[PDB]
Amino acid sequence: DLKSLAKRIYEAYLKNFNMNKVKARVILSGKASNNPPFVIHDMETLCMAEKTLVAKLVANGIQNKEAEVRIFHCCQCTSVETVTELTEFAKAIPGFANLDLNDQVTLLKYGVYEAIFAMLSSVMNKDGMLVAYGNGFITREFLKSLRKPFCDIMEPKFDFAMKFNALELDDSDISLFVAAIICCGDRPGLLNVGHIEKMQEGIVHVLRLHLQSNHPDDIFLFPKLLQKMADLRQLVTEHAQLVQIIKKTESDAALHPLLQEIYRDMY
Ligand SMILES: Cc1cccc(Nc2cc(Cl)nc(SCC(=O)O)n2)c1C
Numbered sequence: 001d002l003k004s005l006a007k008r009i010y011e012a013y014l015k016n017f018n019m020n021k022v023k024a025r026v027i028l029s030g031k032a033s034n035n036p037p038f039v040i041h042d043m044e045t046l047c048m049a050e051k052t053l054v055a056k057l058v059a060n061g062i063q064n065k066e067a068e069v070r071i072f073h074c075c076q077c078t079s080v081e082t083v084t085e086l087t088e089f090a091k092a093i094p095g096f097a098n099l100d101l102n103d104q105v106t107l108l109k110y111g112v113y114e115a116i117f118a119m120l121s122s123v124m125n126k127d128g129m130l131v132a133y134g135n136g137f138i139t140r141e142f143l144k145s146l147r148k149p150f151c152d153i154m155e156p157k158f159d160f161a162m163k164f165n166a167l168e169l170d171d172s173d174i175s176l177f178v179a180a181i182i183c184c185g186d187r188p189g190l191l192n193v194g195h196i197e198k199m200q201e202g203i204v205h206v207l208r209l210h211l212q213s214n215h216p217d218d219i220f221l222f223p224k225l226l227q228k229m230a231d232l233r234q235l236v237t238e239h240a241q242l243v244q245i246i247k248k249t250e251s252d253a254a255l256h257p258l259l260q261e262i263y264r265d266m267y
């Protein structure tokens, strides 16, 4: 029964996310054959990568804009796609589809970015992150090179990811972790907190059992992951504040309407 739950969540994860850790680590390891990632480490390579990966935009003249504005809009596009995937994943979580329609929206509103930065670790190593469906690799140092405030976007997530990747979780662990993130009983605005906590309790229960079987060498792995969930909520809170800064101080860098709605009245 509980392994049913764990397998259903794992299978929904493998099915709904176009990029997962095993596939990411292959690309990140320099392995693979055709269509390897284009490395984006300075202005020259960013322009080259854009001419191949976003041809229509280049024809619209985006390369007249600041590199920081293109990178930010690239980030937004990835976020919209990942929110779409997480929304479908959550539907595959047992019990979620039975919740009130307003509570589903609320759980995903507060959960998506915590889950996003958790799973972002999977496509990060100490030197950069995968982008563009595995076809680009943008270096950590190039991102640090951007003018403020855009140089402050990615680095706190690199810092989180290096410590998160140190736990050596696999997709079977991560799928349960993300399920636990979404089914969070203390989100603001929740109508039926009681059903969500019962849903949360069952998922975390399976997580605890799964980590017991999958990581018998890490005595405190379960409470370490509880702490990472708190760490992610703080990271998202801070991230929403930097995005709000960029929204008002930085013109040319408008916010997408799906993401705008996520941050509205969030924190
Ligand atoms: C790392 C990478 C890969 C592929 C394309 C791009 N540049 C982008 C990507 C996107 Cl989705 N959008 C833009 S500019 C959009 C606009 O100016 O409204 N520029 C970048 C920065």
Ligand SMILES: Cc1cccc(Nc2cc(Cl)nc(SCC(=O)O)n2)c1C
Binding pocket: 072, 075, 076, 078, 079, 080, 082, 116, 119, 120, 130, 131, 153, 154, 157, 243, 259
């Ligand atoms: C899965 C993935 C990989 C790479 C980038 C992104 N989007 C990000 C990541 C970071 Cl650290 N920052 C941003 S700012 C735009 C937004 O708030 O959605 N967007 C995402 C969501």
